[PDB]
Amino acid sequence: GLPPGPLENSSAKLVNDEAHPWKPLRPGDIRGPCPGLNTLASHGYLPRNGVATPAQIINAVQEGFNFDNQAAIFLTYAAHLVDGNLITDLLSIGRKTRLTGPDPPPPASVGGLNEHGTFEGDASMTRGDAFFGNNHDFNETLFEQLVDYSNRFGGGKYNLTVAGELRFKRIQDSIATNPNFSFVDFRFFTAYGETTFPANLFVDGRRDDGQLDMDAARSFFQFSRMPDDFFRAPSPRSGTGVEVVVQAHPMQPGRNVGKINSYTVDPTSSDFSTPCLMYEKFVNITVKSLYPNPTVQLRKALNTNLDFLFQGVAAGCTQVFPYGR
Ligand code: HEM
Ligand SMILES: *[C@@H]1O[C@H](CO)[C@@H](O)[C@H](O)[C@H]1NC(C)=O
Ligand SMILES: *[C@@H]1O[C@H](CO)[C@@H](O)[C@H](O)[C@H]1NC(C)=O
Ligand SMILES: *[C@@H]1O[C@H](CO)[C@@H](O)[C@H](O)[C@H]1NC(C)=O
Ligand SMILES: *[C@@H]1O[C@H](CO)[C@@H](O)[C@H](O)[C@H]1NC(C)=O
Ligand SMILES: CCCCCC
Ligand SMILES: CCCCCC
Ligand SMILES: [Cl-]
Ligand SMILES: [Mg+2]
């Protein structure tokens, strides 16, 4: 279906309402590495089993959290292209599931958001690196470090100052402990953006002060649960303030080279100075590597989702066509 348009009415409102009650997981219900999508599924803004169309996801993040249209479109079609079923139009917000329907040929994985190294990546705040055995479950130890960083840099609250320090700490942790640590291209970009989302979107919209309390933080991060009487943000936003997180500890993109403490800058990687290159590499390398020689119906689905992806890309970039026009 078409990418949904922006909200007609973007006002703060109760989103923990009678039609969107929190419910616990039933057997087969899928939750993954994204606390935003997890919460929308656990409140029935998405299907509660955690399998959704891109249009459902875009409508969910806008209606539930006032995620802005451009950011919703970019992230959703990126995730769908590398992790979703392009024929069925279904994406798992977590583990690989037969519920996304018959699989395309390898090397395409359709592994859901749990798929390491497509969208999901290292130095997550409350999820472990894939190397340590679990890239998707809430980690209490990592959350306790989030609380500690909030206590130290945020006076008990998670804010952009806390985001800047924790983002850097998680990178340094992965460099020290994950011999396979990768922090390039798409992950480099999204890892910074993600640290702003709690401050911008998990803060009750009646306050919108960028100060996330730890009761609200645990409710979202661990239980996929909006606070009682949660109001969504009062205006559309996504990553506003990412500049403060970067400026706190500017990092070059790079990877460990098969050993801990071997972080090596990748001059082939995009960085914040080459945003269009991040888009071009995502399409020409990541998507193309998953679908090198697509059949006619997969090629059509790819080109449609790649057009949709480009709608989410900031003006100034040229669209690239790996399967022609
Ligand atoms: C619009 C479509 C969205 C997609 C496709 C998406 C996808 C993802 C994925 C795959 C991750 C895991 C990346 C990683 O840490 O390895 C992630 C992380 C995250 N997402 Fe989402 N997301 C979306 C929207 C949102 C929204 C609306 C929010 C908040 C309201 C949000 C909050 C977060 C946060 C806080 C994390 C970081 C978790 C952590 O590092 O502990 N996302 N997102
Ligand atoms: C927008 O939504 C808010 C919150 O529900 C509501 O109070 C307001 O009346 C709505 N505005 C319009 C123009 O309907
Ligand atoms: C959570 O993260 C900590 C530190 O990274 C790690 O020791 C632990 O194994 C992870 N998983 C669980 C199951 O607590
Ligand atoms: C985070 O909170 C601390 C302590 O209240 C404060 O010094 C800092 O300015 C805050 N940062 C932001 C961006 O609100
Ligand atoms: C992507 O491929 C297009 C079309 O061939 C080309 O113009 C562009 O330079 C490529 N970009 C990258 C980053 O390889
Ligand atoms: C929606 C984010 C756009 C960034 C890519 C240039
Ligand atoms: C959601 C804002 C853009 C993050 C990736 C460039
Ligand atoms: Cl918007
Ligand atoms: Mg991760």
From Swiss-Prot:
The record's annotation in Gene3D superfamilies points to: Chloroperoxidase-like
What does the entry say about activity and pH?
Answer: Optimum pH is 4.7 with ABTS as substrate. Optimum pH is 7.2 with benzyl alcohol as substrate, and there is another optimum at pH 6.2. Optimum pH is 7.2 with dimethoxyphenol as substrate. Optimum pH is 6.0 with naphthalene as substrate. Optimum pH is 7.0 with pyridine as substrate. Optimum pH is 7.0 with veratryl alcohol as substrate, and there is another optimum at pH 5.5.
Q: Which GO terms describe its molecular function?
A: heme binding; metal ion binding; peroxidase activity
Question: Which cofactors does this protein require?
Answer: heme b
Record note on cofactor: Binds 1 heme b (iron(II)-protoporphyrin IX) group.
What GO biological process terms are annotated to this protein in UniProt? hydrogen peroxide catabolic process
Keywords, comma-separated and alphabetical: Disulfide bond, Glycoprotein, Heme, Hydrogen peroxide, Iron, Metal-binding, Oxidoreductase, Peroxidase, Signal
Give the Enzyme Commission number: 1.11.2.1
Q: Which PROSITE patterns match?
A: HEME_HALOPEROXIDASE
Superkingdom, taxonomy of origin: Eukaryota
Catalytic activity, as annotated = RH + H2O2 = ROH + H2O
- State the PANTHER family in the record: HEME HALOPEROXIDASE FAMILY PROFILE DOMAIN-CONTAINING PROTEIN (PTHR33577:SF16), STERIGMATOCYSTIN BIOSYNTHESIS PEROXIDASE STCC-RELATED (PTHR33577)
This molecule's function is given as: Aromatic peroxidase that oxidizes aryl alcohols into the corresponding aldehydes and then into the corresponding benzoic acids. Oxidizes toluene and naphthalene. Catalyzes the regioselective peroxide-dependent hydroxylation of propranolol and diclofenac to 5-hydroxypropranolol and 4'-hydroxydiclofenac. Catalyzes the regioselective peroxide-dependent hydroxylation of naphthalene to 1-naphthol or 2-naphthol via a naphthalene 1,2-oxide intermediate. Catalyzes the regioselective peroxide-dependent oxidation of pyridine to pyridine N-oxide. Halogenates monochlorodimedone and phenol.
Which family would the database say this protein is a member of? Answer: Belongs to the chloroperoxidase family.
What is the protein name given in its UniProt record? Aromatic peroxygenase
